[PDB]
Amino acid sequence: EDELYRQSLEIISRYLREQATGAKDTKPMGRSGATSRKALETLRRVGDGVQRNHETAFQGMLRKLDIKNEDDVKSLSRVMIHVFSDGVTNWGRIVTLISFGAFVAKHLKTINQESCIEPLAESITDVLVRTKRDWLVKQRGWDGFVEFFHVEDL
C-alpha cells in the first residue's frame, strides 16, 4: 500500500541486508527504482562513512541496547523515536539511524539473528514513514535524501 513505506523499506532493507550479508542484492528495485538505486548508493557512501566514523559510539550504543532478538528491535524503535523527540528532523539523523540499523544488522547476523534484520529494517522504516511522513514528503522523499547528500561537482 504506502509507496513511501514500500520504497523506504526497500532501500533500508537492502542496505541493512547488504551490509549484514555483504552481498549486494542484484534483484532490480520496485518503483522509484532509479531513486531507490541512488538512495541505496547514497546510503552506502554516507551510511558506510557514518559507521566508520562513529564505530566506537555505535558499538557503545549497540552494547547498551543489547539487541539480540526480534523483541530487542522494539527497543530500537524506541531509540529512534527518542532521536526525533527534540522536534528536529534532518537527513543526517535519518541516515544515521539507517546507518546504525546496518551496524545492528551486521551484529545481528553474527548471532543467528538474520531473522531480525527484516524486523530491524521494518522498525526503522516504520519510525521514519509512520512518524516523519510529513517531513519526508516535504523533503521529496528519497529524492531529497539523494540530493541532500549529493556530492556536487565544481
Binding site: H54, I81, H82, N90, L97, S99
Partner: peptide
C-alpha cells in the same frame, strides 16, 4: 548516554 540523544548528535553531525 541515552542512545537516542547520542544518535541525534551524530545525525546532526552527519547532516552537515
Amino acid at each position: 548516554g541515552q542512545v537516542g540523544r547520542q544518535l541525534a548528535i551524530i545525525g546532526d553531525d552527519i547532516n552537515r
